[PDB]
């Protein structure tokens, strides 16, 4: 049904697509809808019921947290579906060292399209209406990686050490960590950010 | 709409097909040499307006016989 | 090697992606988009340049170049149904046949395809016109 | 004493800050000495011709053309100190090219430190109260930035020609141009910005 791109290997056609399908994401109001679907990762915590007493809904530091975060993706890859994306949420291969951000992400504003309107782009970020607050993002040049290697980044490294064992518990709980780099790394100190567990469901970055 | 183009576009390749049988090349057309040249707007126009690359490079009808392409 | 088939041969799934594709296709935001798409043809009028103040419909009718230029119309429209996952390339109604019903595809005014059980309004039985005011099915 | 008046980019966090804090406060501000009062003195609503039709008050084409803005911008300035503005109203040099926009103004959100909440600048734009409608701007020219062959730059040799003229008139003409061209780089074709006489004093960057 689908095919996962990178996100530089995204065309403009492909991703003019998904610029307009997260704009339409943002816009629904329903469940099925960004607002609603971002929830489902942290706060607001509805995961044991409404009820008051509530914890986080995502699973982290189990072995069930590779599945959750997977069914997640599917859950908006779904939504875009719907929104019309021709394709699959793309990946951002954190390992390669990044020599910049993603422009995709990075552009503010995408002001490329036949009308050449100018607009904020979805893809760039998102606002927390519960919070009423709006997510941020501080991130570390660090993240251009340097190494002796040059190909060997520590994710790279730290993702390929995972990768060399048999045992899935095992490889969870090397897998889990190396995931826990960029939420630091985007996030930085901001309370409201991919860098907080609750918040980071927030930012679109999240999904690639 | 698209159906029914795509109906008459395939009658328009029924019949290249027919001149073919007749020994005229299919993709030459002898005649509005001027005209065929003329890309056809807006697929002439890209981007933003026409995401399409095909269509753009397409533009010229000359080009536009050889439905193949 | 995109195929064209005749309406009435294709199948449900194939009528499923064409009906699933060109529904997402209305809601593309994207100058790709439906909406945008249709602008080509006629109003509002694009031909001068998107921003003209006369502008001309995109009609090279009653010209030869004519069938070369719809040829390109409905691939546009081919590959963007394709972005949307058109499994199979635009149908074709052969109206050459007499036929007493008019093609179930494009007249069911609801679609309830099996697979998802759901029921939805046919995107192929009409659209909506934006632009214009009339937000009217397309009659 | 006398407020001095420094470049947006020598401006200190401190300083800015305080820029942030008092336009955002001054926008508020519902007084006539409010920004928004102050923002019809340039254009719309025009009443600048009392009684017979309005036009646009703010003089263009004329050698009077840089004495109303200069007495406009101190009106501003005057405003902000109510503000408690620490310093005057920075300026932004177009003249030297610049790689990116300044931070100040371009920035569509501040992020205070201490993670404080990102919040729209003030400075990145304003609204309309009498039209409801929200300034903004697009600049089509992004290319405008360091384009130089060397120190010349196309302003500096328009400005530079302007400079060598000792009639103050025929100065204004050459200078004039000049300023113009601000304006319509930063509005591009968006009808509420810069581009617009009328609309163009709401944005903030009319200001600096
Ligand atoms: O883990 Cu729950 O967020 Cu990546
Ligand atoms: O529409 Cu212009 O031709 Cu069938
Ligand atoms: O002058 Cu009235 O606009 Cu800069």
């Not at chain 1, 809904?57 to 069930?64: D, K, S, V």
């Not at chain 3, 010209?63 to 409905?74: I, N």
């Not at chain 3, 697979?115 to 099915?137: A, L, M, Q």
Request: with cysteine; net charge negative; aromatic share 12%.
């Amino acid at each position: 049904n689908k095919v996962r791109h990178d996100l530089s290997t995204l065309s403009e056609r492909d991703i003019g697509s998904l610029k307009y399908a997260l704009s339409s994401l943002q816009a629904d109001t329903s469940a099925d809808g960004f607002a609603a679907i971002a929830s489902f990762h942290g706060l607001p915590a509805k995961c044991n019921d409404s009820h008051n007493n509530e914890v986080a809904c995502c699973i982290h530091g189990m072995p069930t947290f590779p599945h959750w975060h997977r069914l997640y993706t599917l859950q908006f890859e779904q939504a875009l579906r719907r929104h019309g994306s021709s394709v699959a949420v793309p990946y951002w291969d954190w390992t390669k060292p990044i020599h910049n951000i993603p422009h995709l992400f990075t552009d503010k504003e995408y002001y490329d399209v036949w009308r050449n309107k100018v607009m904020p782009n979805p893809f760039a970020r998102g606002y927390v209406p519960s919070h009423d607050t709006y997510t941020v993002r501080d991130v570390q040049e660090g993240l251009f990686h340097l190494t002796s290697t040059g190909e060997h980044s520590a994710l790279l490294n730290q993702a390929l050490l995972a990768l060399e064992q048999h045992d899935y518990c095992d490889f969870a709980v090397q897998f889990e960590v190396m995931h826990n780099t960029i939420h630091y790394l985007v996030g930085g100190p901001q309370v409201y950010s991919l860098s907080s567990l609750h918040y980071a469901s927030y930012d679109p970055i999240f999904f690639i | 709409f698209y159906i029914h183009h795509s109906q008459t576009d395939r009658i328009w390749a029924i019949w290249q097909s027919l001149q073919r049988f007749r020994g005229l090349s299919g993709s030459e057309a002898n005649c509005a040499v001027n005209l065929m040249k003329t890309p056809l707007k807006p697929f002439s126009f890209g981007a933003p307006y026409n995401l399409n690359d095909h269509t753009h490079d397409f533009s010229k009808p000359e080009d536009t016989f050889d439905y193949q392409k | 090697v995109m195929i064209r088939k005749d309406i009435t041969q294709l199948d449900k799934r194939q009528q499923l992606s064409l009906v699933k594709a060109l529904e997402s296709m209305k809601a593309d935001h994207s100058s790709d988009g439906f909406q945008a798409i249709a602008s080509f043809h006629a109003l509002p009028p694009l031909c001068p340049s998107p921003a003209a103040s006369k502008r001309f419909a995109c009609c090279v009718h009653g010209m030869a170049t004519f069938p070369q230029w719809h040829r390109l119309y409905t691939v546009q429209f081919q590959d963007s149904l394709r972005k949307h996952g058109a499994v199979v390339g635009l149908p074709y109604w052969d109206w050459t046949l007499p036929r007493s019903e008019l093609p179930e595809l494009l007249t069911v005014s609801t679609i309830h395809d099996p697979e998802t059980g759901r029921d939805i309004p046919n995107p192929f039985i009409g659209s909506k016109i934006e632009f214009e005011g009339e937000n009217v099915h397309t009659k | 004493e006398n407020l001095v008046r420094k470049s947006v980019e020598h401006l200190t966090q401190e300083e800015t800050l305080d820029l942030q804090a008092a336009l955002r406060e001054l926008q508020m501000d519902s007084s006539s000495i409010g920004f928004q009062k102050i923002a019809a003195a340039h254009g719309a609503p025009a009443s600048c011709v009392h009684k017979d039709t309005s036009i646009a008050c703010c003089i263009h084409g004329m050698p009077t053309f840089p004495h109303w803005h200069r007495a406009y911008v101190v009106h501003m300035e005057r405003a902000l100190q109510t503000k408690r503005r620490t310093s005057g109203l920075p300026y932004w040099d177009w003249t030297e090219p610049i790689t990116q926009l300044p931070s100040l103004a371009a920035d569509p959100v501040y992020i205070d430190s201490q993670g404080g909440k990102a919040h729209t600048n003030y400075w990145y734009r304003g609204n309309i109260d009498f039209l409801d409608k929200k300034t903004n701007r697009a600049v089509d020219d992004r290319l405008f930035e360091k384009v130089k062959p060397g120190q010349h730059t196309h302003l500096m040799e328009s400005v530079l020609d302007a400079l060598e003229q000792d009639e103050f008139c025929k100065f204004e003409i050459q200078f004039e141009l000049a300023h113009n061209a601000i304006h319509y780089l930063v509005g591009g074709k968006h009808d509420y910005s810069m581009a617009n006489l009328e609309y163009t004093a709401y944005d903030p960057i009319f200001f600096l």
